[PDB]
Amino acid sequence: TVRKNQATLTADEKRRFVAAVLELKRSGRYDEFVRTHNEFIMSDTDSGERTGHRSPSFLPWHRRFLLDFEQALQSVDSSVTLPYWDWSADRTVRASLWAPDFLGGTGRSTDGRVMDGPFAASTGNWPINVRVDSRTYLRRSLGGSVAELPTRAEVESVLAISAYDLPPYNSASEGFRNHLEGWRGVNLHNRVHVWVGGQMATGVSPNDPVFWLHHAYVDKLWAEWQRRHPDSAYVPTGGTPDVVDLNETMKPWNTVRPADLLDHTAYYTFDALEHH
C-alpha cells in the first residue's frame, strides 16, 4: 500500500507494474476504464451535471477511479501499486519514465506512433480499441503542443491557495481545485495532458498508461494541499444542484461520497509526504 515516485522504482517493480497493466489490457478490463473515463469527459459540463471533471469532485472522483484501477492491478499481482510522476521534477523526455523498460518514449514525427517500450503497437500487446481518432496505435508527442511542463514554483503557487473550490464550482472557478485541474491560472493538470500529446490529449486519455502516473501525482498534490491547509476542506457542503456535495454519492459507483475519500491514508500512503 505505498505509492512511490516512478523515478525510484526498482527494475523488478517496473517489470511487475508493466506485466500487470498488460494483463488488464489482455483480459479486456483495461479498456473499460478508458470507456468510463471518456463517458464522463463527454458528459461533465459547466452548466449541467458534472462529476468527474470541471467540478469539486474532480479530485475525489479520480482518487476513487485510481483506486479501482490499482485494485484491478493488485488482482493480477498483489505487490503492485500505482507510482506517481512528479512532472515538475522529471520534466524532459530523458526521464527514466520514458525509457523502453517502463513506458516507452515519444512518438515518431510522421504519425505520432510510439516505437519502443512495452506499449508500442509493434509488440502486439497494446491495441488502441476505445478511440475517437481511428488509429489503433499508441501515440505521443512529448513537448509538441506546449513546450514546458509545470515547474515546482508554479505548483507551489497553486498549493498556497487556501479555498478548496468556489462557486460556480466549474471551469470558471477560482480556488485550489480549478487551478490544480488547470482551467484557470498557470495550469497544472490539463497542461500535462497537452504536453504528452497523442491519446493523453483526448477524452480517451487512459489509453496511455502514463495517465495513471499523472493522476497519482495530482492526487498527491491534493494530499499536500491538505497538509498545508488543515483548516480547509471539500466544498460545497450541501444542496448544490448539478455538483457533488461533500456527503453526496458519486457516479458511477453510487455508494461512495467525497467525504469517504478525503483521507487517502485509509487506502494508501506515499513514499514521502511533508507534514504541515
Binding site: 505520432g112 495532458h193 497537452v194 490529449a201 483526448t202
Partner: protein
Amino acid sequence: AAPESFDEVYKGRRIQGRPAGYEVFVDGVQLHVMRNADGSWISVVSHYDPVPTPRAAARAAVDELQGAPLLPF
C-alpha cells in the same frame, strides 16, 4: 446566442459547424465538442486545451487526426 455556422476546407478536409448547443463535423463525421464557461471550446480529441471558437476546435481536430478518419462518438 450560439456562434455562427461555418463551412470550409482546412488542410484538405471539410469542417462544418452549426448551432443545434453546437455541432461540428469533420468530413461529415460528427465531432464531440463542448463549450467552457469562459466561452472557449474543446473537442474530444483536444479535450484539455481550450481554443476560442468551434472553428478553432474543428481545426485543432484536423491537426490532431493527421489524415485519419474520425470515428463516430
